[PDB]
């Protein structure tokens, strides 16, 4: 290698301070020019190396405002290691100086025009790494030529295809659909799969604006994919990776095919179906290696096939088969596969030919969530249950959501509560179910529950009223946990104030017990809740006279009557003196049943 | 697979060469470089045998580096430090006490039951060691030992071994056995810490004279726990603690103050010690607001409780707590709380001037709390009210939006405290109805039209101005406006009905809020049933809000006085909040 | 397509960076920080895939270096997850049990290896066999 | 000096500070902040006699296609905690900044989208105001884009009002005002004429506009002290307003 | 007492640390990172209680010095301790900055074992420590 490089680097690591680093960097920069300016011209070794150091410094994050001419002269060296560093330097530090750009283009002109594929290589990569407009103008017409010419070497070909692709993404106008097209297409039948792999990328990008121009590829892509996926143990030994034949080219071919509708030639359609059926079978075969690389490679192919199946949306057997294979992934230690499986099923649940297939796995989705650890995976499990939810599901879905919530983290609570409410509204069988859901939603995670939603659950307990006693007891048994949060105390206290009589008969839930329970929440609650509890409290004075004085002395108290809050003190005075002044007929007139709400 | 796990080259192999290189200056550089790698999360565990062999040394700086490295694996995995245990015990009857201690502290920062065996007896010798830096580190080590689970009964030849070292010829040593003692003691059965007590106090409060900055405090804190009997016992206890304007203000100072306030249950002014002690305590506390900003916050959170208990102490000293513009927000705010806790009938003088200062500044949060503060001035001290309301009226004239709204809210609470007094101002207050965005303020005006409806004739058109956009409106305002208008009616029938239909009809028929709906009905069922019994039930003489705002329940306040140093003293919360 | 590839250590320090999109150096630095923040915070219970700005990142951790490919949302996750490993196997053969410092002292050769396997935001060559043979032919030259 | 000429005088020495911030977000339908940045500037409007020396103080938040953390001060600003300057007279920009960390996102947008085959699309979107309840956000708009092949649309919303605009392929929902710590919903049943004929609907994001009375970066002004040496008045004599306006920039949620 | 001492950088990264009680794991370091260092619209105070765990902190240029416990400690002490550690460090290597911290990892571990045993604040004014401390501080300007 270059000793002076290795030393500079070792000195930079031994440095015991960002001071000393910066000193050793400024030292080298002086030395480097110096020697660039110096009267004695340098050997290739030294240019090559000092450029290289400049690149290094740059990659540590420091500025470099010279070197560029020296990097450019290396281009014209006939020594590979010298070219390589010059080409790397200009690829990493792109400078504006249109004097240099012209020189760089000469070098590329020569190297390309040399017939040396290493030099052709460096040239094509430089172009491809930099993609300058000026580079496009110099070369965009030549690259297709090199790509097709009968005589250029495979490695050059590969490098030229992807070069061209980049020229097409940054400078499309310098890449008209000339005459090379079909000769590009023919590359799909090359023996060197690296070449095939390169061309497929090119063609894919080209066929998104130019479908008719490359529509020839479909047939040759199907042929290749099918020969590939049926290849034996001892076939494509180069391109077999952990017993999987040509996973990356397979993916790519499958992707090219997503540019087009189903092949129009029946026989072709058939070869493609045979093909996918085959991929789909291999997923059912057990691993040939216990190494995760094998199945990741296999599944990459599977999933791209699954994508193709979705996009064609035309073979219902395949969609169904795809669902079921996805479903078996949901029960896997691989977080990666769990994740991708939920992802693809979610897509699959919006096509008729697959919607009901997806519904089939409800139970597995729920069991996966019920025991999942990656939050992104839980997230997506819940999104699937929302996707697959209808009338047949609503209740099973809601019940498990609720169940999951009882012991849920926090990460996920917010989303599920929102979902529970929404599905409840849309799919409520009967009023009662709904109320059973909401009240329990509120008991478990009322901190996330909307006002609109708790307004509604109260507002509903009128119209179809026969739920009042249930509501009353539920709210009660809920409230009597030491745990217990605010929007419960709100709905809890509103309901018991209004229908607590239906549960006062039980001595486990007497007026006095109801009351104290509520009051053991009171001084912990925000002031609007206490405004509400104060109304509960006087309703209690009216319904239960057995307990009017326990209540009056919580009202006569200082902390109620001299309350800093206007509404609290207003109510505590208005109510204290209601229980005192007027009649008992009056009191009962004023705090009666409370009329039912109107409609939408 | 095991890519980059390569052992036969890379940075690990390189550093291993240098840990084995025969020049101890290059080996020192290895061990540092390995300490620097742990610190950047590199797995240097591979090297542990080569780094342990660097301890086979004369050079001090070298052993020192290895102990550091071994101390990093104490907490990380205590299993990784079970493998140099045989030559720890060796390194604690060593020549040089610097090394002796260095095996004891590192033995006691390891957390598994392979530690009981080799250390039970060597620590027995570091407490009987003739060098006090080792007995400083043995004392703290005895404390470390209890930490690891189980009671043990050879442990009751260890508690006593500690009690010995409370009696010692070194304030560093004794003051640490003390720290050990109270801590170990608070995994609590009752009668622990030997009540050879009348004596051992004399040993603590002598140590405290000559003691280090931090030795004093472990002392001070361990006293307060105990209740003396009778009575003049208390006297000299407290006459020793006197020179605490010491080193570590405020830990020293406040850990004293803690003691100097549990023992203020004397027959007080039978002998004026009480009057001596209280003259003393003002100056030192005052000094802690010169200290540093953080240290202050704590000081003030204690001062706050202290001022509520023994208000005499800082009564004369309010200017101490005036706000500096550059004070962090949290020192500003606690300053403010206390400024009002001390607002005497006399110092409202500048105190009020000192808040007009604050409400004109740029820190919007602090501005607001300042004009609240003026509020609870008018409310605490009755004779300021007139001048507070004047100031408030001035601030409102500036037209600074946030100041106005805060002021209006405060003015409402003042009317409630001093009814039928500041009524001409109402007219000038309604002038600013244009620019009240915030719910609170709108609710205050509305309540103020109130309540004084029968004073003002436009009152209807005013209250009607809100019925347009009754929704869009804070449910607090809605409530307040409901109540406001039933007042209007309960003193002007015929006149009001123009509108009062609307408002009951909007709470009852239009509002989704069930609490609000309730209230419309309740009022609808009073008014449209009994035209006089309603007046009784609403317009009753409400009692006067007495200033309960900032104020702690007197029982809880004594709990927190018996804690003044601690965390509970900052949270103003009992330790039940964190078991 | 691939937008960029990074190799980084636990500490945040970059050991390789190859960009297939226009960014200024300030931005390149910001992205390098952002990626470190996202990836060093995840234990082995997390997936190897995570959304990142308007793209996503496939990553794997070999000891104390994180290999990271940032790609388009619609690109195949496992394809790239295994591209990474295929690349690491090449690196491992080319440097005979590769270690972090190999990528430091030979940093300019690392780019050679990359351009072999990736060009213009796409997989170029996947064959370990071919890549090594080219690489060793390249090394023998002057 | 050279930005502040000699012998200025005013009966009434005032100054105004306007903190003006724009907040940008991209977010996943799961609520993962993919990118976010705030662009800000403090604008000072100063009417102060003489040559006032000013000492300005603020909280920790600012440190001194890809957003970079940055801060740029007026030519007048000197550095040392705190910033100090003799300001130009009237209005000027004291500082410009950009932050990327610890941004306060005024709203969470939670989309629920459901492609029923190829003929109906169901869209629900809930927005949560994520700030102090005592504060109010205004000029809220939610803009929910629809696919091109949209036959028709029916929309229900309980708060504000909304409607489908076909030239813009968008449901546009408006809320005049909304307090912190509230929640709101809209539902939409969109009908689809099925062309396509290749390519699933490539779905553009949901975007919001709003305005809030605080700095989504967290910037808080703590002091601004005026010291005029020659003249008659002091910092106690100077009237001072602060305003915070937080505006939406590109505030996007993928659906 | 002082059950955990961590020093962060301007991004909530643990630059260097030393636990003193097993009663606090990773769950501590994160809480402080998430709620204090990357705090949103919260009432900042030098002392915070989250997860039933208390947190003290000071700030130096861009550096976060934290101190942590589940005990009912002498609050006043912690800050007093902490200002002296900063008195110590700055007298070994000047400015108390992310760089200078970074240059002196070996040294700082050493001040820590010495300045603080099992969490108990010990004799920690410069001159006393010239005996017990072997390293020098890499001062830069
Ligand atoms: O490091 P130094 O001892 O100063 O030697 C350097 C230099 O190394 P750096 O410039 O990279 O530090 C050369 O390169 P290497 O071969 O070590 O990589 C070179 O030596 P060569 O001429 O053999 O290349 C040269 O010249 P010299 O031969 O005179 O030592 C020069 O030293 P000067 O700075 O004294 O020219």
| DSSP codes joined into one string, B489-501 | HHH-TTTTHHHHH
Q: Of A4, A37, A57, which is best to mutate to test ligand 1, by the most ligand atoms within 8 angstroms of its C-beta? A: A4
Is A53 among the annotated ligand-binding positions? yes
The minimum CA-CA distance between D198 and chain A, rounded to whole Å, is 7
The verdict on D98 and D109 lying in the same domain is no
Is A537 among the annotated ligand-binding positions? no
Residues of C in contact with A371 (CB under 8 A): none
A31 lines ligand 1 (CB under 6 A): yes
Structural domain count, chain E:
1
Token digits for C2? Answer: 């691939």
- In order of B77, B373, B402, the CA distances from B370 in angstroms are 53, 5, 12
| Burial group, residue A300, by CB count within 10 angstroms (0-12, 13-18, 19+) | buried
A12/B232 Cα distance (integer angstroms) = 72
- Residue B41 falls in which region: left (phi positive, over 0), alpha (psi -120 to 50) or beta: left
Q: Whose CA is nearest to atom 10 of ligand 1?
A: A4
A477/D184 Cα distance (integer angstroms) = 30
Residue A564 phi, psi (nearest 5): -55, -40
| Crossing angle between the packed helical segments B97-107 and B132-147, to the nearest 10 degrees | 10
Question: A100: how many CB neighbours lie within 10 A of its CB?
Answer: 15
Burial B361-376 (b: 16+ CB within 10 A, else e): bbbbebbbbbbbbbbb
CATH number of the domain to which E104 belongs:
3.30.450.60
CA B469 to chain centre: 44
Is A4 among the annotated ligand-binding positions? yes
| C62 vs B4, B11, B14: nearest CB | B4
Mutate to test the interface with D, among A452, A456, A527 (most CBs of D within 10 A): A452
Domain assignments of chain A as residue spans, ordered by start: 1-600
D138/D132 Cα distance (integer angstroms) = 14
Token digits for B82? Answer: 């079970």
Residue B254 phi, psi (nearest 5): -60, -35
Pairing of strands D170-179, D107-116: unpaired
Cβ pair B237, B263 in contact under 8 A: yes
CB–CB of E102 and A16 under 8 A? no
Mutate to test the interface with C, among A64, A163, A251, A302 (most CBs of C within 10 A): A251
D189/B279 Cα distance (integer angstroms) = 78
Cβ pair E52, E38 in contact under 8 A: no
3-state secondary structure of E6: strand
CB–CB of D60 and E59 under 8 A? yes
Is A52 among the annotated ligand-binding positions? yes
Name every residue whose Cβ is closer than 8 Å to that of residue A390 and which is 6 or more positions away in sequence: A427
Mutate to test the interface with B, among E69, E74, E113 (most CBs of B within 10 A): E74
- Mind spelling out the 3-state secondary structure of B146-173? HHCCCCCCHHHHCHHHHHHHHCCCCHHH
CB–CB of C100 and B11 under 8 A? yes
What are the beta bridge partners of residue C17?
C6
Separation of A38 CA from ligand 1 center, angstroms?
A: 14
**Prior bond of A547 cis (ω within 30°):** no
The structure was resolved to a resolution in Å of 2.6
- Which helix (H) or strand (E) segment holds residue A46: the answer is helix A44-59
D237/A373 Cα distance (integer angstroms) = 61
A42 lines ligand 1 (CB under 6 A): no
Token digits for D83? Answer: 């910033």
A418/A413 Cα distance (integer angstroms) = 9
| Burial group, residue B169, by CB count within 10 angstroms (0-12, 13-18, 19+) | exposed
3-state secondary structure of A72: helix
Burial B175-201 (b: 16+ CB within 10 A, else e): bbbbbbbbbbeeeeeeeebeeeeeebb
Residue ranges of alpha helices (H) inside B159-214 are 159-166, 171-185, 197-210
Residues recorded for chain B: 579
A244/A297 Cα distance (integer angstroms) = 7
Interface check D60 vs E, CB under 8 A:
yes
> By C-alpha distance, which of A41, A38, A52 is closest to A3?
A52
A230/A20 Cα distance (integer angstroms) = 61
CA distance between the termini of chain A: 83
CB–CB of B3 and C62 under 8 A? yes
The minimum CA-CA distance between A347 and chain D, rounded to whole Å, is 9
- In order of A27, A416, A452, A516, the CA distances from A406 in angstroms are 65, 11, 22, 26
Burial E78-90 (b: 16+ CB within 10 A, else e): bbbbbbbbeebbe
| Burial group, residue D156, by CB count within 10 angstroms (0-12, 13-18, 19+) | exposed
| Burial group, residue D116, by CB count within 10 angstroms (0-12, 13-18, 19+) | middle
CB–CB of C53 and D68 under 8 A? no
| Crossing angle between the packed helical segments B215-224 and B251-262, to the nearest 10 degrees | 20
The verdict on D145 and D255 lying in the same domain is yes
**Prior bond of D139 cis (ω within 30°):** no
Question: A108: how many CB neighbours lie within 10 A of its CB?
Answer: 24
B118/B486 Cα distance (integer angstroms) = 84
A window 389-408, beta carbon within 8 A of C: none
What are the beta bridge partners of residue C4?
C19, C70
Q: Whose CA is nearest to atom 1 of ligand 1?
A: A4
- In order of B36, E62, E100, E114, E137, the CA distances from E90 in angstroms are 20, 15, 9, 16, 9
Pairing of strands E120-121, E116-117: antiparallel
Residue ranges of alpha helices (H) inside B263-363 are 274-287, 293-309, 329-341, 348-358
Residue B461 phi, psi (nearest 5): -50, -35
A494/A492 Cα distance (integer angstroms) = 6
Cβ pair C53, D32 in contact under 8 A: no
> By C-alpha distance, which of D149, D128, D147 is closest to D204?
D147
CA distance between the termini of chain C: 34
Token digits for D233? Answer: 């008045």
Question: Domain span at residue C140?
Answer: 1-142
Is A37 among the annotated ligand-binding positions? no
CATH number of the domain to which D151 belongs:
2.60.40.1170
Token digits for A275? Answer: 């093909």
Question: E31: how many CB neighbours lie within 10 A of its CB?
Answer: 17
For chain C, which residues lie within 8 Å of any Cβ of chain B, measuring from their own Cβ?
Answer: 10-11, 62-65, 88-89, 91-92, 97-102
B247/B237 Cα distance (integer angstroms) = 20
- In order of D100, D205, E47, the CA distances from E32 in angstroms are 20, 34, 11
- The CATH class that applies to domain A1-600 reads mainly alpha
Cβ pair C107, A56 in contact under 8 A: yes
Pairing of strands D70-73, C49-52: unpaired
Sign, Cα dihedral of A328, A330, A335, A340: positive
Question: Domain span at residue D169?
Answer: 105-211+251-255
What are the beta bridge partners of residue C67?
C7, C60
Token digits for E126? Answer: 């410069």
A476/A99 Cα distance (integer angstroms) = 85
Cβ pair D245, D43 in contact under 8 A: no
Cβ pair B104, B138 in contact under 8 A: yes
- In order of A297, A390, B504, B576, E7, the CA distances from E56 in angstroms are 50, 52, 54, 20, 12
Closest residue on chain D to B401 (Cα) = D241
Name every residue whose Cβ is closer than 8 Å to that of residue B355 and which is 6 or more positions away in sequence: B370, B371, B373, B374, B377, B391
Name every residue whose Cβ is closer than 8 Å to that of residue B326 and which is 6 or more positions away in sequence: D57, D82, D223
Name every residue whose Cβ is closer than 8 Å to that of residue D192 and which is 6 or more positions away in sequence: D118, D119, D120, D121, D147, D149, D150, D151
CATH of B1-579 among 2.115.10.20, 1.10.1040.10, 1.25.10.10, 3.30.450.90: 1.25.10.10
* Residue with token string 């208000």: B311
- In order of A569, D36, D112, D188, the CA distances from D144 in angstroms are 46, 20, 11, 10
The minimum CA-CA distance between B37 and chain E, rounded to whole Å, is 10
Token digits for A128? Answer: 């491809």
Cβ pair A311, A258 in contact under 8 A: yes
Neighbour order of strands in the sheet with E63-69: E14-19, E4-8, E63-69, E53-60, E47-50
B92/E132 Cα distance (integer angstroms) = 16
Cβ pair B180, B142 in contact under 8 A: yes
A40 lines ligand 1 (CB under 6 A): no
What does the DSSP 8-state code read for residue C6?
Answer: E
Structural domain count, chain C:
1
**Prior bond of D118 cis (ω within 30°):** no
The minimum CA-CA distance between E34 and chain D, rounded to whole Å, is 10
**Prior bond of B250 cis (ω within 30°):** yes
- Mind spelling out the 3-state secondary structure of chain D? CCCCCCCCCCCCCEEEEEEEEEEEEEECCCCCEEEEEEEEEEEEEEECCCCCEEEEEECCCCCCCCCCCEEEECCCEEECCEEEECCCCEEEEEEEEEECCCCCCCEEEEEEEEEECCCEEEEEEEEEECCCCCCEEEEEEEEEECCCCEEEEEEEECCCEEEEEHHHCEEEEEEEEEECCCEEEEEEEEEECCCCCCCCCCCCCEEEEEEECCCCCCCCEEEEEEECCCCCCCHHHCEEEEEEEEEEEEEEECC
| Burial group, residue A234, by CB count within 10 angstroms (0-12, 13-18, 19+) | exposed
Cβ pair A69, A108 in contact under 8 A: no
Experimental method: X-ray
Closest residue on chain C to D70 (Cα) = C26
B397/B395 Cα distance (integer angstroms) = 5
A290 lines ligand 1 (CB under 6 A): no
Instruction: Give me the torsion for CA of A434, A438, A439, A445, rounded to 10°.
Output: 160
């Amino acid at each position: 290698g270059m000793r002076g490089l290795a030393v500079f680097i070792s000195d930079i690591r031994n440095c015991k301070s960002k001071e000393a680093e910066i000193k050793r960097i400024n030292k080298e920069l002086a030395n480097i020019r110096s020697k660039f300016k110096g009267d004695k011209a340098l050997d290739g070794y030294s240019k090559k190396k000092y450029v290289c150091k400049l690149l290094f410094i740059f990659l540590l994050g420091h500025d470099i405002d010279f070197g560029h001419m020296e990097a450019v002269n290396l281009l014209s060296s006939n020594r590979y290691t010298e070219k390589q560093i010059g080409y790397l330097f200009i690829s990493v530090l792109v400078n504006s100086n249109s004097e240099l750009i012209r020189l760089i283009n000469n070098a590329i002109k020569n190297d390309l025009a040399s017939r040396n594929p290493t030099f052709m290589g460096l040239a094509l990569h430089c172009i491809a790494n930099v993609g300058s407009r000026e580079m496009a103008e110099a070369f965009a017409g030549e690259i297709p030529k090199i790509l097709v010419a009968g005589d250029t070497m495979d490695s050059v070909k590969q490098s030229a295809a992807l070069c061209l692709l980049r020229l097409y993404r940054t400078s499309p106008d310098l890449v008209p659909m000339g005459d090379w097209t079909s000769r590009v297409v023919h590359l799909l039948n090359d023996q060197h799969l690296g070449v095939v792999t390169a061309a497929t990328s090119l063609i894919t990008t080209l066929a998104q604006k130019n479908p008719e121009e490359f529509k020839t590829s479909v047939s040759l892509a199907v042929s290749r994919l099918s020969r590939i996926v049926t290849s034996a143990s001892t076939d494509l030994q180069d391109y077999t990776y952990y017993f999987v034949p040509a996973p990356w080219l397979s993916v790519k071919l499958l992707r090219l095919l997503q540019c087009y509708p189903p092949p129009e030639d029946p026989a072709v359609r058939g070869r493609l179906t045979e093909c996918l059926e085959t991929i789909l079978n291999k997923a059912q075969e057990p691993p040939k290696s216990k190494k995760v690389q094998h199945s990741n490679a296999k599944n990459a192919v599977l999933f791209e096939a699954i994508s193709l199946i979705i996009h064609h949306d035309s073979e219902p057997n395949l969609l169904v088969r795809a669902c079921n294979q996805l479903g078996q992934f949901l029960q896997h230690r691989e977080t990666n596969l769990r994740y991708l499986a939920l992802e693809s099923m979610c897509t699959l649940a919006s096509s008729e030919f697959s919607h009901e297939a997806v519904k089939t796995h409800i139970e597995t989705v729920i069991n996966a969530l019920k025991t999942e650890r990656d939050v992104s995976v839980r997230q997506r499990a819940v999104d699937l249950l929302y996707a697959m939810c209808d009338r047949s599901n609503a209740q099973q879905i809601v019940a498990e959501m609720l169940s999951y919530l009882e012991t849920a983290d926090y990460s996920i609570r917010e989303e599920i509560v929102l979902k529970v409410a929404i599905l409840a509204e849309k799919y409520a069988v009967d009023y009662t179910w709904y109320v059973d859901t909401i009240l329990n939603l509120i008991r478990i995670a009322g901190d996330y529950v909307s006002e609109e939603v708790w307004y509604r659950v109260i507002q509903i307990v009128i119209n179809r009223d026969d739920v009042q006693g249930y509501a009353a007891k539920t709210v009660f048994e809920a409230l009597q946990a030491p745990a217990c949060h605010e929007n419960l105390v709100k709905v809890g206290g509103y309901i018991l104030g209004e229908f607590g009589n239906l549960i006062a008969g039980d001595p486990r839930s007497s007026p006095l017990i109801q009351f104290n329970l509520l009051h053991s929440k009171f001084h912990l609650c925000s002031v609007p809740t206490r405004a509400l509890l104060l109304s509960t409290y006087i309703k209690f004075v009216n319904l239960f006279p057995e307990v009017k004085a326990t209540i009056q002395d919580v009202l006569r108290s200082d902390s109620q009557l001299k309350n800093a809050d206007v509404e609290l003190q207003q109510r505590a005075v208005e109510y204290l003196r209601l229980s005192t002044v007027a009649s008992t007929d009056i009191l009962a007139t004023v705090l009666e049943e409370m009329p039912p709400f109107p409609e939408r | 697979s095991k890519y980059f796990t390569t052992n036969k080259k890379g940075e690990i192999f390189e550093l291993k060469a240098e840990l084995n290189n025969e020049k101890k200056e290059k080996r020192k550089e290895a061990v540092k470089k390995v300490i620097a790698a742990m610190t950047v999360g590199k797995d240097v565990s591979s090297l542990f045998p080569d780094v342990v062999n660097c301890m086979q040394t004369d050079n001090l700086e070298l052993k020192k580096l290895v102990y550091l490295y071994l101390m990093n694996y104490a907490k990380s995995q205590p299993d990784m430090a079970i493998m140099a245990v045989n030559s720890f015990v060796k390194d604690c009857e060593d020549p040089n006490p610097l090394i002796r201690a260095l095996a004891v502290r590192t033995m006691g920062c390891i957390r598994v039951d392979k530690i009981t065996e080799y250390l039970c007896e060597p620590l027995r010798k570091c407490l009987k060691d003739e060098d006090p830096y080792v007995r400083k580190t043995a004392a703290v080590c005895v404390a470390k030992l209890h930490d690891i689970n189980a009671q043990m009964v050879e442990d009751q030849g260890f508690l006593d071994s500690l009690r010995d070292l409370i009696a010692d010829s070194n304030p560093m040593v004794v003051a640490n056995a003390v720290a050990a003692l109270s801590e170990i003691s608070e995994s609590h059965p009752n009668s622990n810490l030997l009540d050879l007590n009348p004596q051992n106090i004399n040993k603590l409060l002598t140590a405290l004279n000559e003691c280090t900055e931090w030795g004093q405090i472990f002392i001070l804190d361990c006293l307060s726990n105990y209740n003396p009997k009778d009575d003049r016992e208390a006297q000299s206890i407290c006459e020793r603690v006197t020179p605490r304007l010491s080193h570590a203000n405020s830990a020293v100072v406040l850990s004293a103050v803690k003691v100097l306030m549990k023992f203020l249950e004397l027959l007080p002014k039978d002998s004026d010690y009480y009057n001596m002690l209280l003259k003393k305590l003002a100056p030192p506390l005052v000094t802690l607001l010169s200290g540093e900003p953080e240290v202050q916050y704590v000081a003030l959170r204690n001062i706050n409780l202290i001022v509520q208990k023994r208000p005499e102490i800082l009564k004369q000293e309010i200017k101490v707590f005036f706000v500096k513009y550059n004070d962090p927000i949290y020192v500003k705010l606690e300053k403010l709380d206390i400024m009002i806790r001390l607002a005497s009938q006399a110092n409202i003088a500048q105190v009020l001037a000192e808040l007009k200062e604050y409400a004109t500044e740029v820190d919007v949060d602090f501005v607001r709390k300042a004009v609240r503060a003026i509020g609870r001035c008018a409310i605490k001290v009755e004779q300021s009210a007139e001048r507070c309301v004047s100031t408030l009226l001035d601030l409102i004239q500036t037209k600074v939006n946030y100041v106005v709204q805060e002021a209006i809210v405060v003015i409402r609470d003042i009317f409630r405290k001093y009814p039928n007094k500041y009524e001409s101002i109402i007219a000038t207050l309604c002038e600013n109805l244009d620019s009240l965005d915030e719910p609170d303020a709108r609710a205050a005006m509305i309540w103020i039209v109130g309540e004084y409806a029968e004073r003002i004739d436009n009152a209807d058109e005013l209250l009607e101005s809100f019925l347009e956009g009754f929704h869009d409106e804070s449910t607090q305002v809605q409530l307040t406006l409901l109540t406001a208008i039933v007042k209007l009616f309960l003193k002007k029938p015929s006149e009001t009905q123009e509108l009062v239909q609307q408002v009951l009809s909007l709470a009852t028929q239009d509002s989704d809020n069930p609490d609000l709906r309730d209230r419309g009905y309740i009022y609808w069922r009073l008014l449209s049933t009994d035209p006089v019994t309603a007046k009784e039930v609403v317009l009753s003489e409400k009692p006067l809000i007495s200033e309960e705002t900032d104020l702690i329940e007197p029982t809880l306040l004594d709990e927190l006085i018996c804690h003044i140093g601690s965390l509970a003293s900052v949270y103003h919360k009992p330790p039940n909040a964190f078991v | 397509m691939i937008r960029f590839i990074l190799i980084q250590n636990r500490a945040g320090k970059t050991r390789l960076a190859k960009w297939y999109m226009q960014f200024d150096d300030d931005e390149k630095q910001k992205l390098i920080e952002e990626v470190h923040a996202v990836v060093t915070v995840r234990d082995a219970k997390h997936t190897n895939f995570v959304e990142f700005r308007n793209f996503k990142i496939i990553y794997r951790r070999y000891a104390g270096l994180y290999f990271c490919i940032c790609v388009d949302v619609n690109d195949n996750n496992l394809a790239y997850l295994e591209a990474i490993h295929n690349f690491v196997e090449v690196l491992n053969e080319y440097f005979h049990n590769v270690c972090e410092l190999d990528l430091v002292f030979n940093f300019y050769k690392v780019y050679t290896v990359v351009d072999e396997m990736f060009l213009a935001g796409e997989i170029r060559e996947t064959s370990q066999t071919k890549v090594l043979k080219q690489l060793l032919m390249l090394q023998s030259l002057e | 000096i050279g930005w502040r000429r000699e012998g200025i005088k005013y009966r009434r020495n005032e100054l105004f500070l306007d903190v003006l911030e724009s907040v940008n977000l991209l977010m996943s339908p799961q609520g993962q902040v993919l990118s976010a940045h705030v662009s800000g500037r403090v604008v000072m409007k100063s009417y102060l006699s003489g040559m006032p020396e000013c000492k300005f103080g603020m909280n920790d938040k600012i440190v001194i296609s890809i957003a970079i953390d940055d801060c740029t001060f007026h030519q007048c600003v000197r550095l040392s905690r705190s910033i100090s300057f003799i300001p130009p007279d009237g209005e000027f920009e004291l500082m410009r900044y950009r932050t990327t960390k610890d941004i306060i996102l005024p709203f969470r947008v939670i989309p629920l989208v459901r492609e029923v085959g190829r003929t109906k699309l169901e869209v629900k979107v809930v927005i949560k105001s994520n700030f102090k309840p005592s504060l109010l956000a205004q000029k809220i708009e939610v803009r929910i884009p629809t696919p091109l092949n949209t036959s028709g649309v029916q929309v229900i919303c309980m708060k504000g009002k909304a409607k489908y605009k076909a030239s813009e392929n968008a449901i546009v929902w408006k809320i005049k005002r909304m307090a912190g710590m509230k929640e709101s919903q809209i539902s939409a049943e969109i009908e689809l004429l099925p062309t396509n004929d290749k390519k699933k609907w490539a779905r553009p994001p949901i975007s919001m506009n709003f305005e809030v009375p605080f700095a989504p970066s967290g910037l808080k002004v703590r002091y601004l002290k005026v010291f005029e040496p020659k003249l008659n008045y002091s910092d106690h004599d100077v009237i001072k307003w602060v305003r915070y306006i937080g505006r939406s920039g590109i505030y996007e949620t993928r659906c």
